[PDB]
Amino acid sequence: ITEDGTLLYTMRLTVRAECPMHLEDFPMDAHACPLKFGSYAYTRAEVVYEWTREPARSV
């Protein structure tokens, strides 16, 4: 908790996500496994998410 209210809250997770695959070039295929995270019970008019650094340097 910074003195001006700016909070910081990190967790250590082990996410097992779904990566839909089109195995039509097996085994010479390329995939793009996504990881979508958003808010529950809070719409856009209330809680908006944003990357903290340049979007190329966040993940």
Epitope: D4, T6, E50, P55, A56
Partner: antibody
């Protein structure tokens, strides 16, 4: 909400100019602060950005060392100092804050510098 | 370094017709391309933050269209105060702007 830049400068080639950008209406610790240059009748060009909470400043590779970006959180000001300048950077310098989707919503007004003798 | 090739360089169009401008990015920029409207002797004003999201106070005649590399700004019924430059600038990486299009009337 309202960015007040400095006035125009008339500087001799080979000196250092320090342009100021006072942010009124918010705290600079919340957002970033981008500096943009614009030569007359040409496209915009990025100079560098600064994170006023830490002091992490990134510059364009062709602007590293020539320009430096510092801040002052007490007066809510961003300073851009051009270390060594030639007679070519007679452009208009804008000060902007990052917006919602990393756009620059609020821009300054431009301190049109002039390098001559 | 991501470069934004904005087209066309300078177009001339009459009042009341639909107009479209294109901004092709070199590398990938997801939806972080913003469109600014710079009138002469004034500071640029943000029109479209993100792809297809108008900024507060922008008329509904401006519409964006986003993709991975190509982005489009369509103006509908064009009024008489829309004679200005229109820069496209990504923000997915360190921001690099386009060359801009000097809009003209004819």
């Amino acid at each position: 909400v309202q960015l007040q830049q400095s006035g125009a400068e008339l500087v001799k080639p080979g000196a250092s100019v320090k342009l100021s950008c006072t942010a009124s209406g918010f705290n600079i610790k919340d957002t970033y602060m981008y500096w943009v240059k614009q030569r007359p009748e040409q496209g915009l060009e990025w100079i560098g950005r600064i994170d006023p909470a830490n002091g992490d400043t990134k510059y364009d590779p062709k602007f590293q060392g020539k320009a430096t970006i510092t801040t002052d959180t007490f007066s809510n000001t961003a300073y851009l100092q051009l270390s060594s300048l030639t007679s070519e950077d007679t452009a208009v310098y804008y000060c902007a804050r990052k917006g919602l989707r990393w756009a620059m919503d609020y821009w300054g007004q431009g301190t049109s510098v002039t390098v001559s003798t | 370094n991501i470069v934004m090739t904005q087209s066309p360089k300078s177009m001339s169009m009459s009042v009341g017709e639909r107009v479209t401008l294109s901004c092709k990015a070199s590398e990938y920029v997801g939806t972080y391309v913003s469109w600014y409207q710079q009138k002469p002797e004034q500071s640029p004003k943000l029109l479209i933050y993100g792809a297809s999201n108008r900024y507060t106070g922008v008329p509904d005649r401006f519409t964006g269209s986003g993709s991975a590399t190509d982005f489009t700004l369509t103006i509908g019924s064009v009024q008489a105060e829309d004679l200005a430059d229109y820069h496209c600038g990504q923000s997915y990486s360190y921001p690099t702007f386009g060359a801009g299009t000097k809009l003209e009337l004819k």
